[PDB]
PDB file of C-alpha atoms in Angstrom:
ATOM      1  CA  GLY A   1     -82.626 -64.738   4.397  1.00 43.16           C
ATOM      2  CA  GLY A   2     -83.171 -66.716   1.194  1.00 43.39           C
ATOM      3  CA  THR A   3     -84.333 -70.255   0.491  1.00 43.64           C
ATOM      4  CA  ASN A   4     -82.530 -73.185  -1.112  1.00 45.27           C
ATOM      5  CA  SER A   5     -83.084 -73.280  -4.881  1.00 42.97           C
ATOM      6  CA  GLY A   6     -79.655 -74.028  -6.399  1.00 42.30           C
ATOM      7  CA  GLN A   7     -76.236 -72.476  -7.165  1.00 42.32           C
ATOM      8  CA  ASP A   8     -75.418 -71.242  -3.665  1.00 39.61           C
ATOM      9  CA  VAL A   9     -72.711 -68.901  -5.054  1.00 39.02           C
ATOM     10  CA  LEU A  10     -75.308 -66.495  -6.422  1.00 32.77           C
ATOM     11  CA  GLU A  11     -75.205 -63.361  -4.181  1.00 36.02           C
ATOM     12  CA  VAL A  12     -78.255 -61.835  -5.855  1.00 37.49           C
ATOM     13  CA  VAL A  13     -80.602 -60.583  -3.073  1.00 37.59           C
ATOM     14  CA  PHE A  14     -78.683 -57.604  -1.700  1.00 37.82           C
ATOM     15  CA  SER A  15     -81.819 -55.935  -0.284  1.00 36.56           C
ATOM     16  CA  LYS A  16     -81.532 -56.271   3.509  1.00 35.92           C
ATOM     17  CA  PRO A  17     -79.299 -59.114   4.756  1.00 34.52           C
ATOM     18  CA  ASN A  18     -80.887 -59.493   8.222  1.00 34.22           C
ATOM     19  CA  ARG A  19     -78.954 -57.048  10.417  1.00 35.11           C
ATOM     20  CA  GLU A  20     -80.263 -58.849  13.522  1.00 34.05           C
ATOM     21  CA  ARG A  21     -78.724 -62.086  12.153  1.00 33.29           C
ATOM     22  CA  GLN A  22     -75.311 -60.817  11.110  1.00 33.74           C
ATOM     23  CA  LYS A  23     -75.296 -59.443  14.645  1.00 35.69           C
ATOM     24  CA  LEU A  24     -75.768 -63.054  15.788  1.00 33.21           C
ATOM     25  CA  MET A  25     -72.910 -64.390  13.674  1.00 32.00           C
ATOM     26  CA  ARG A  26     -70.594 -61.923  15.428  1.00 32.83           C
ATOM     27  CA  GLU A  27     -71.887 -62.293  18.989  1.00 33.45           C
ATOM     28  CA  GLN A  28     -72.219 -66.108  18.992  1.00 33.92           C
ATOM     29  CA  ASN A  29     -68.547 -66.616  17.937  1.00 34.36           C
ATOM     30  CA  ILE A  30     -69.452 -67.944  14.487  1.00 33.95           C
ATOM     31  CA  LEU A  31     -67.003 -65.595  12.742  1.00 36.92           C
ATOM     32  CA  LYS A  32     -64.239 -66.559  15.179  1.00 40.08           C
ATOM     33  CA  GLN A  33     -64.522 -70.246  14.256  1.00 39.63           C
ATOM     34  CA  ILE A  34     -64.428 -69.461  10.526  1.00 38.77           C
ATOM     35  CA  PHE A  35     -61.031 -67.802  10.992  1.00 39.70           C
ATOM     36  CA  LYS A  36     -59.855 -70.892  12.878  1.00 39.24           C
ATOM     37  CA  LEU A  37     -61.086 -73.156  10.071  1.00 38.55           C
ATOM     38  CA  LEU A  38     -59.158 -71.194   7.414  1.00 40.41           C
ATOM     39  CA  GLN A  39     -55.666 -71.459   8.924  1.00 41.32           C
ATOM     40  CA  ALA A  40     -56.209 -74.973  10.323  1.00 38.96           C
ATOM     41  CA  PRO A  41     -55.482 -76.971   7.100  1.00 38.32           C
ATOM     42  CA  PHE A  42     -52.305 -75.020   6.343  1.00 38.89           C
ATOM     43  CA  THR A  43     -51.016 -75.645   9.861  1.00 44.51           C
ATOM     44  CA  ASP A  44     -52.057 -79.265   9.258  1.00 46.23           C
ATOM     45  CA  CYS A  45     -50.051 -79.612   6.030  1.00 41.77           C
ATOM     46  CA  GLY A  46     -47.126 -77.635   7.458  1.00 43.39           C
ATOM     47  CA  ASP A  47     -46.755 -79.236  10.880  1.00 46.25           C
ATOM     48  CA  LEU A  48     -48.946 -76.514   0.589  1.00 45.55           C
ATOM     49  CA  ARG A  49     -51.429 -73.919  -0.650  1.00 43.50           C
ATOM     50  CA  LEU A  50     -50.809 -73.995  -4.412  1.00 42.22           C
ATOM     51  CA  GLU A  51     -47.041 -74.536  -4.758  1.00 45.01           C
ATOM     52  CA  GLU A  52     -47.252 -78.104  -3.393  1.00 46.38           C
ATOM     53  CA  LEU A  53     -50.956 -78.761  -2.764  1.00 45.84           C
ATOM     54  CA  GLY A  54     -52.379 -77.099  -5.867  1.00 41.40           C
ATOM     55  CA  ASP A  55     -53.433 -80.377  -7.451  1.00 43.37           C
ATOM     56  CA  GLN A  56     -56.833 -81.137  -8.990  1.00 39.45           C
ATOM     57  CA  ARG A  57     -57.604 -83.706  -6.264  1.00 40.51           C
ATOM     58  CA  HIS A  58     -58.301 -80.850  -3.811  1.00 45.05           C
ATOM     59  CA  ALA A  59     -61.473 -79.715  -5.586  1.00 47.55           C
ATOM     60  CA  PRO A  60     -64.041 -80.293  -2.766  1.00 49.07           C
ATOM     61  CA  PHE A  61     -61.447 -79.532  -0.083  1.00 49.64           C
ATOM     62  CA  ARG A  62     -61.074 -75.980  -1.407  1.00 51.21           C
ATOM     63  CA  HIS A  63     -64.854 -75.709  -1.811  1.00 51.71           C
ATOM     64  CA  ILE A  64     -65.194 -74.887   1.902  1.00 52.45           C
ATOM     65  CA  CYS A  65     -62.494 -72.211   1.861  1.00 51.30           C
ATOM     66  CA  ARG A  66     -64.324 -70.379  -0.923  1.00 52.50           C
ATOM     67  CA  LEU A  67     -67.556 -70.753   1.057  1.00 52.88           C
ATOM     68  CA  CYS A  68     -65.978 -69.401   4.245  1.00 54.82           C
ATOM     69  CA  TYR A  69     -64.901 -66.270   2.385  1.00 55.41           C
ATOM     70  CA  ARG A  70     -68.366 -66.003   0.830  1.00 55.56           C
ATOM     71  CA  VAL A  71     -70.072 -66.068   4.229  1.00 55.98           C
ATOM     72  CA  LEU A  72     -67.415 -63.659   5.526  1.00 54.25           C
ATOM     73  CA  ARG A  73     -68.421 -61.312   2.708  1.00 54.18           C
ATOM     74  CA  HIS A  74     -72.139 -61.698   3.465  1.00 55.13           C
ATOM     75  CA  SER A  75     -71.543 -60.854   7.139  1.00 53.87           C
ATOM     76  CA  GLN A  76     -70.220 -57.316   6.619  1.00 57.90           C
ATOM     77  CA  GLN A  77     -72.633 -55.888   4.034  1.00 61.39           C
ATOM     78  CA  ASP A  78     -73.823 -52.449   5.225  1.00 63.67           C
ATOM     79  CA  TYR A  79     -72.628 -53.174   8.778  1.00 66.28           C
ATOM     80  CA  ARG A  80     -69.772 -51.311  10.472  1.00 64.09           C
ATOM     81  CA  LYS A  81     -69.268 -53.692  13.417  1.00 65.90           C
ATOM     82  CA  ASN A  82     -68.774 -56.761  11.222  1.00 66.36           C
ATOM     83  CA  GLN A  83     -66.517 -54.773   8.872  1.00 66.64           C
ATOM     84  CA  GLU A  84     -64.180 -53.707  11.667  1.00 65.60           C
ATOM     85  CA  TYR A  85     -64.314 -57.187  13.242  1.00 64.50           C
ATOM     86  CA  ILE A  86     -63.148 -58.717   9.955  1.00 66.36           C
ATOM     87  CA  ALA A  87     -60.563 -55.962   9.403  1.00 66.00           C
ATOM     88  CA  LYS A  88     -59.065 -56.660  12.835  1.00 63.15           C
ATOM     89  CA  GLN A  89     -58.164 -60.115  11.426  1.00 59.59           C
ATOM     90  CA  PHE A  90     -56.664 -58.633   8.256  1.00 58.40           C
ATOM     91  CA  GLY A  91     -53.127 -59.822   9.023  1.00 61.78           C
ATOM     92  CA  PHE A  92     -53.399 -63.369   7.683  1.00 63.17           C
ATOM     93  CA  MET A  93     -56.031 -62.651   5.011  1.00 63.30           C
ATOM     94  CA  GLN A  94     -53.277 -60.725   3.178  1.00 62.50           C
ATOM     95  CA  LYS A  95     -51.410 -63.984   2.440  1.00 61.27           C
ATOM     96  CA  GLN A  96     -53.912 -65.335  -0.090  1.00 56.79           C
ATOM     97  CA  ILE A  97     -55.591 -62.719  -2.328  1.00 61.36           C
ATOM     98  CA  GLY A  98     -53.968 -63.949  -5.512  1.00 60.15           C
ATOM     99  CA  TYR A  99     -54.975 -67.599  -5.165  1.00 59.28           C
ATOM    100  CA  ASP A 100     -58.210 -69.470  -5.861  1.00 61.84           C
ATOM    101  CA  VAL A 101     -59.699 -69.258  -2.343  1.00 62.50           C
ATOM    102  CA  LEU A 102     -61.863 -66.308  -3.500  1.00 60.88           C
ATOM    103  CA  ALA A 103     -60.244 -63.878  -1.055  1.00 60.83           C
ATOM    104  CA  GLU A 104     -60.086 -61.070  -3.634  1.00 60.90           C
ATOM    105  CA  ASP A 105     -63.846 -60.423  -3.694  1.00 58.18           C
ATOM    106  CA  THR A 106     -64.255 -60.129   0.080  1.00 59.62           C
ATOM    107  CA  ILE A 107     -61.255 -57.834   0.578  1.00 55.86           C
ATOM    108  CA  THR A 108     -62.581 -55.220  -1.881  1.00 57.58           C
ATOM    109  CA  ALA A 109     -65.856 -54.912   0.041  1.00 55.55           C
ATOM    110  CA  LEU A 110     -64.088 -53.850   3.247  1.00 53.53           C
ATOM    111  CA  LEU A 111     -62.395 -50.908   1.497  1.00 50.69           C
ATOM    112  CA  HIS A 112     -65.357 -49.731  -0.617  1.00 52.53           C
ATOM    113  CA  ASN A 113     -66.330 -46.140   0.330  1.00 52.71           C
ATOM    114  CA  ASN A 114     -65.547 -46.284   4.060  1.00 53.89           C
ATOM    115  CA  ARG A 115     -63.546 -43.654   5.937  1.00 54.04           C
ATOM    116  CA  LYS A 116     -62.783 -44.309   9.577  1.00 57.42           C
ATOM    117  CA  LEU A 117     -61.950 -48.015   9.635  1.00 58.01           C
ATOM    118  CA  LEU A 118     -59.837 -47.731   6.475  1.00 56.55           C
ATOM    119  CA  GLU A 119     -57.807 -44.826   7.841  1.00 55.27           C
ATOM    120  CA  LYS A 120     -56.962 -46.702  11.075  1.00 53.49           C
ATOM    121  CA  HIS A 121     -56.754 -50.398  10.151  1.00 53.03           C
ATOM    122  CA  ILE A 122     -54.240 -50.093   7.292  1.00 54.41           C
ATOM    123  CA  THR A 123     -50.765 -49.165   8.548  1.00 52.80           C
ATOM    124  CA  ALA A 124     -47.364 -48.554   6.973  1.00 49.66           C
ATOM    125  CA  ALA A 125     -46.151 -52.039   7.927  1.00 51.54           C
ATOM    126  CA  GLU A 126     -49.053 -53.578   5.997  1.00 52.02           C
ATOM    127  CA  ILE A 127     -48.027 -51.586   2.917  1.00 51.60           C
ATOM    128  CA  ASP A 128     -44.349 -52.487   3.400  1.00 52.81           C
ATOM    129  CA  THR A 129     -45.211 -56.183   3.517  1.00 55.74           C
ATOM    130  CA  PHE A 130     -47.780 -55.523   0.771  1.00 53.83           C
ATOM    131  CA  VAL A 131     -45.043 -54.460  -1.687  1.00 52.54           C
ATOM    132  CA  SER A 132     -43.329 -57.861  -1.173  1.00 52.39           C
ATOM    133  CA  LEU A 133     -42.923 -60.637  -3.771  1.00 58.92           C
ATOM    134  CA  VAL A 134     -46.336 -59.653  -5.209  1.00 59.98           C
ATOM    135  CA  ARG A 135     -45.144 -56.261  -6.444  1.00 62.31           C
ATOM    136  CA  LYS A 136     -41.887 -58.046  -7.173  1.00 61.48           C
ATOM    137  CA  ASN A 137     -44.039 -60.278  -9.423  1.00 60.17           C
ATOM    138  CA  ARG A 138     -46.370 -59.896 -12.411  1.00 62.71           C
ATOM    139  CA  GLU A 139     -50.213 -59.728 -12.781  1.00 61.14           C
ATOM    140  CA  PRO A 140     -51.087 -56.054 -12.075  1.00 63.75           C
ATOM    141  CA  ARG A 141     -54.632 -56.944 -11.074  1.00 60.15           C
ATOM    142  CA  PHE A 142     -53.050 -57.051  -7.639  1.00 57.99           C
ATOM    143  CA  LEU A 143     -51.646 -53.594  -8.450  1.00 58.44           C
ATOM    144  CA  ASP A 144     -55.053 -52.055  -8.969  1.00 55.89           C
ATOM    145  CA  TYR A 145     -56.111 -54.021  -5.883  1.00 57.56           C
ATOM    146  CA  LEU A 146     -53.573 -51.648  -4.349  1.00 59.52           C
ATOM    147  CA  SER A 147     -54.968 -48.711  -6.322  1.00 58.81           C
ATOM    148  CA  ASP A 148     -58.601 -48.956  -5.201  1.00 59.42           C
ATOM    149  CA  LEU A 149     -57.478 -48.761  -1.575  1.00 58.68           C
ATOM    150  CA  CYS A 150     -54.920 -46.095  -2.537  1.00 58.30           C
ATOM    151  CA  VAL A 151     -57.117 -42.979  -2.743  1.00 56.01           C
ATOM    152  CA  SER A 152     -60.270 -44.430  -4.325  1.00 55.07           C
ATOM    153  CA  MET A 153     -63.053 -43.332  -1.975  1.00 52.45           C
ATOM    154  CA  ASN A 154     -65.802 -40.756  -2.495  1.00 50.59           C
ATOM    155  CA  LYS A 155     -63.069 -38.085  -3.131  1.00 50.04           C
ATOM    156  CA  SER A 156     -59.442 -37.753  -1.997  1.00 44.36           C
ATOM    157  CA  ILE A 157     -58.880 -39.467   1.355  1.00 44.36           C
ATOM    158  CA  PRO A 158     -56.232 -37.367   3.164  1.00 44.14           C
ATOM    159  CA  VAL A 159     -54.928 -39.934   5.676  1.00 42.99           C
ATOM    160  CA  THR A 160     -53.610 -42.915   3.690  1.00 38.91           C
ATOM    161  CA  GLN A 161     -52.519 -40.974   0.595  1.00 39.76           C
ATOM    162  CA  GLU A 162     -49.281 -39.833   2.226  1.00 36.71           C
ATOM    163  CA  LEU A 163     -48.984 -43.382   3.587  1.00 41.25           C
ATOM    164  CA  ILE A 164     -48.922 -44.813   0.050  1.00 41.34           C
ATOM    165  CA  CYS A 165     -47.026 -41.946  -1.648  1.00 41.28           C
ATOM    166  CA  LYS A 166     -43.887 -42.734   0.390  1.00 41.69           C
ATOM    167  CA  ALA A 167     -43.894 -46.459  -0.431  1.00 41.07           C
ATOM    168  CA  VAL A 168     -44.239 -46.991  -4.189  1.00 43.89           C
ATOM    169  CA  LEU A 169     -41.410 -44.625  -5.203  1.00 42.96           C
ATOM    170  CA  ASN A 170     -39.567 -44.094  -1.881  1.00 42.37           C
ATOM    171  CA  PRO A 171     -37.485 -46.042  -2.616  1.00 40.89           C
ATOM    172  CA  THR A 172     -37.876 -47.013  -6.278  1.00 42.51           C
ATOM    173  CA  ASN A 173     -37.891 -50.815  -5.817  1.00 43.19           C
ATOM    174  CA  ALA A 174     -40.713 -53.359  -6.352  1.00 44.09           C
ATOM    175  CA  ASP A 175     -40.937 -53.631 -10.162  1.00 42.12           C
ATOM    176  CA  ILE A 176     -39.137 -50.349 -10.384  1.00 42.10           C
ATOM    177  CA  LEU A 177     -41.054 -48.299 -13.000  1.00 41.27           C
ATOM    178  CA  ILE A 178     -41.669 -48.125 -16.697  1.00 42.45           C
ATOM    179  CA  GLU A 179     -39.194 -45.286 -17.103  1.00 43.25           C
ATOM    180  CA  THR A 180     -39.984 -42.767 -19.849  1.00 39.86           C
ATOM    181  CA  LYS A 181     -37.152 -40.243 -19.899  1.00 37.06           C
ATOM    182  CA  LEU A 182     -37.264 -38.573 -23.382  1.00 36.82           C
ATOM    183  CA  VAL A 183     -34.002 -40.219 -24.427  1.00 37.79           C
ATOM    184  CA  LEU A 184     -33.549 -37.741 -27.347  1.00 37.24           C
ATOM    185  CA  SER A 185     -32.257 -40.077 -30.052  1.00 36.88           C
ATOM    186  CA  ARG A 186     -33.500 -41.698 -33.262  1.00 37.00           C
ATOM    187  CA  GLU A 187     -38.736 -36.315 -33.738  1.00 40.01           C
ATOM    188  CA  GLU A 188     -36.859 -37.700 -30.695  1.00 38.64           C
ATOM    189  CA  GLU A 189     -39.381 -40.360 -29.745  1.00 37.26           C
ATOM    190  CA  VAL A 190     -39.673 -41.633 -26.182  1.00 36.47           C
ATOM    191  CA  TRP A 191     -38.090 -44.852 -24.889  1.00 36.51           C
ATOM    192  CA  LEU A 192     -39.621 -46.800 -21.998  1.00 38.08           C
ATOM    193  CA  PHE A 193     -37.844 -49.335 -19.787  1.00 36.80           C
ATOM    194  CA  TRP A 194     -39.385 -52.709 -18.945  1.00 35.98           C
ATOM    195  CA  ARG A 195     -37.616 -55.793 -17.608  1.00 39.44           C
ATOM    196  CA  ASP A 196     -38.197 -59.478 -16.911  1.00 42.09           C
ATOM    197  CA  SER A 197     -37.122 -59.099 -13.228  1.00 46.28           C
ATOM    198  CA  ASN A 198     -34.041 -61.275 -13.862  1.00 46.45           C
ATOM    199  CA  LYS A 199     -31.250 -59.222 -15.440  1.00 47.02           C
ATOM    200  CA  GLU A 200     -30.422 -55.904 -17.139  1.00 43.88           C
ATOM    201  CA  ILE A 201     -33.384 -53.839 -18.278  1.00 42.89           C
ATOM    202  CA  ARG A 202     -33.632 -55.063 -21.930  1.00 41.69           C
ATOM    203  CA  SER A 203     -36.059 -52.533 -23.396  1.00 39.54           C
ATOM    204  CA  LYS A 204     -36.778 -52.880 -27.121  1.00 44.65           C
ATOM    205  CA  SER A 205     -38.739 -49.616 -27.662  1.00 43.38           C
ATOM    206  CA  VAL A 206     -42.226 -48.212 -27.372  1.00 47.08           C
ATOM    207  CA  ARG A 207     -42.308 -47.994 -31.186  1.00 47.36           C
ATOM    208  CA  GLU A 208     -41.986 -51.779 -31.431  1.00 50.40           C
ATOM    209  CA  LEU A 209     -45.070 -52.010 -29.195  1.00 47.44           C
ATOM    210  CA  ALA A 210     -47.101 -50.035 -31.761  1.00 44.06           C
ATOM    211  CA  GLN A 211     -47.164 -52.983 -34.176  1.00 44.04           C
ATOM    212  CA  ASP A 212     -47.668 -55.336 -31.203  1.00 44.02           C
ATOM    213  CA  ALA A 213     -51.257 -54.152 -30.693  1.00 45.22           C
ATOM    214  CA  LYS A 214     -52.462 -56.779 -33.179  1.00 47.24           C
ATOM    215  CA  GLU A 215     -50.196 -59.695 -32.175  1.00 44.37           C
ATOM    216  CA  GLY A 216     -46.909 -60.409 -30.445  1.00 46.26           C
ATOM    217  CA  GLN A 217     -45.278 -62.022 -27.436  1.00 44.83           C
ATOM    218  CA  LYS A 218     -47.031 -62.424 -24.086  1.00 42.95           C
ATOM    219  CA  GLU A 219     -44.636 -59.959 -22.460  1.00 40.93           C
ATOM    220  CA  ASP A 220     -45.405 -57.627 -25.372  1.00 38.93           C
ATOM    221  CA  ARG A 221     -49.097 -58.369 -24.758  1.00 36.16           C
ATOM    222  CA  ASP A 222     -49.148 -57.381 -21.094  1.00 36.14           C
ATOM    223  CA  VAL A 223     -46.473 -54.654 -20.862  1.00 36.37           C
ATOM    224  CA  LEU A 224     -49.005 -52.120 -22.195  1.00 39.46           C
ATOM    225  CA  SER A 225     -51.599 -53.285 -19.657  1.00 38.91           C
ATOM    226  CA  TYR A 226     -49.066 -53.002 -16.815  1.00 38.56           C
ATOM    227  CA  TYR A 227     -48.052 -49.501 -17.917  1.00 39.82           C
ATOM    228  CA  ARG A 228     -51.710 -48.453 -18.198  1.00 41.79           C
ATOM    229  CA  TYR A 229     -52.484 -49.856 -14.741  1.00 43.02           C
ATOM    230  CA  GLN A 230     -49.640 -48.043 -13.013  1.00 44.22           C
ATOM    231  CA  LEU A 231     -50.477 -44.875 -14.957  1.00 43.35           C
ATOM    232  CA  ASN A 232     -54.017 -45.094 -13.610  1.00 43.22           C
ATOM    233  CA  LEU A 233     -52.370 -45.526 -10.197  1.00 44.59           C
ATOM    234  CA  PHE A 234     -50.254 -42.409 -10.788  1.00 46.72           C
ATOM    235  CA  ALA A 235     -53.272 -40.415 -11.993  1.00 45.66           C
ATOM    236  CA  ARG A 236     -55.424 -41.401  -9.010  1.00 44.65           C
ATOM    237  CA  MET A 237     -52.393 -41.182  -6.708  1.00 44.46           C
ATOM    238  CA  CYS A 238     -52.548 -37.420  -6.050  1.00 46.66           C
ATOM    239  CA  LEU A 239     -56.062 -36.144  -6.981  1.00 45.23           C
ATOM    240  CA  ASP A 240     -55.650 -33.159  -4.624  1.00 47.57           C
ATOM    241  CA  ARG A 241     -53.149 -30.718  -3.059  1.00 49.25           C
ATOM    242  CA  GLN A 242     -50.546 -33.313  -2.056  1.00 49.05           C
ATOM    243  CA  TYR A 243     -47.031 -31.847  -1.908  1.00 53.41           C
ATOM    244  CA  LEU A 244     -45.313 -35.148  -1.052  1.00 53.56           C
ATOM    245  CA  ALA A 245     -45.899 -36.640  -4.525  1.00 55.06           C
ATOM    246  CA  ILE A 246     -46.180 -33.537  -6.701  1.00 58.52           C
ATOM    247  CA  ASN A 247     -42.539 -32.620  -7.477  1.00 56.30           C
ATOM    248  CA  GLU A 248     -41.151 -36.116  -8.062  1.00 57.78           C
ATOM    249  CA  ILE A 249     -43.843 -36.636 -10.715  1.00 55.73           C
ATOM    250  CA  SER A 250     -43.409 -33.125 -12.148  1.00 57.05           C
ATOM    251  CA  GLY A 251     -39.788 -33.271 -13.307  1.00 54.27           C
ATOM    252  CA  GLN A 252     -40.371 -36.859 -14.328  1.00 55.18           C
ATOM    253  CA  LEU A 253     -42.850 -36.823 -17.253  1.00 59.09           C
ATOM    254  CA  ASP A 254     -42.714 -33.057 -17.645  1.00 57.51           C
ATOM    255  CA  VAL A 255     -45.120 -30.901 -19.652  1.00 60.43           C
ATOM    256  CA  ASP A 256     -43.390 -31.535 -22.990  1.00 59.97           C
ATOM    257  CA  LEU A 257     -43.235 -35.309 -22.461  1.00 59.51           C
ATOM    258  CA  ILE A 258     -46.843 -35.763 -21.311  1.00 59.34           C
ATOM    259  CA  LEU A 259     -48.000 -33.689 -24.306  1.00 59.87           C
ATOM    260  CA  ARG A 260     -45.736 -35.531 -26.753  1.00 59.63           C
ATOM    261  CA  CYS A 261     -47.837 -38.644 -26.118  1.00 59.34           C
ATOM    262  CA  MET A 262     -50.960 -36.607 -26.975  1.00 62.70           C
ATOM    263  CA  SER A 263     -50.086 -37.361 -30.614  1.00 65.09           C
ATOM    264  CA  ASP A 264     -52.037 -39.468 -33.126  1.00 65.33           C
ATOM    265  CA  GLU A 265     -49.699 -42.474 -32.908  1.00 66.86           C
ATOM    266  CA  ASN A 266     -50.990 -46.047 -32.903  1.00 65.06           C
ATOM    267  CA  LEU A 267     -51.605 -47.105 -29.292  1.00 61.57           C
TER     268      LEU A 267
END
């Protein structure tokens, strides 16, 4: 409902985005043609997203893909029908969160404090293909993009929590863990396991990471952030009486081990 004044990616007037008009963009097949326009260039270059067509020459060509996602995001604000219409086409939108087509901002808005569409649109197959070579990879921003749809609602969604608690650690694949096991050696400080996803585990220590808070290697930079992100995931994983992920995480990181890290050490 605004007027042209400059910097069209502004998103500032979130007062009342013309419910009678975002009804029109669903009924008049506008949102259908936007989905066709997104997958058209990739089918053009196939018979290419960033691995082969990630060059700087495609600066205005990708300016329409980040506008299509922007107008997709503006269509579903405070509107259930548009939200479920977009979430019915969630299958191919999953391919491109981590890239520069601005798909990460729109996908968070669909899962923000909604009950019924979230508990029915997301299935176990989506999680199983969602723990693919993205959880096999780095950058745990996509991991807390898992975590905000994990349980993060008003309080303690009871439908999808058992759907996610049998995927991350059953089995233990997909960037396995950062395994703290109270190794009881040279009192008896903990030893955590982190790997480069190529070979044997190759864990220096957690004590070497204490002096790495000021400077160090990039892997030493982000291993603490990855551990913190999955620990936030583990904290917000249960939140309630959930038997299916309460005994695996009880023997692992038991009462002595969780309290041993309540010390005054440099973190």
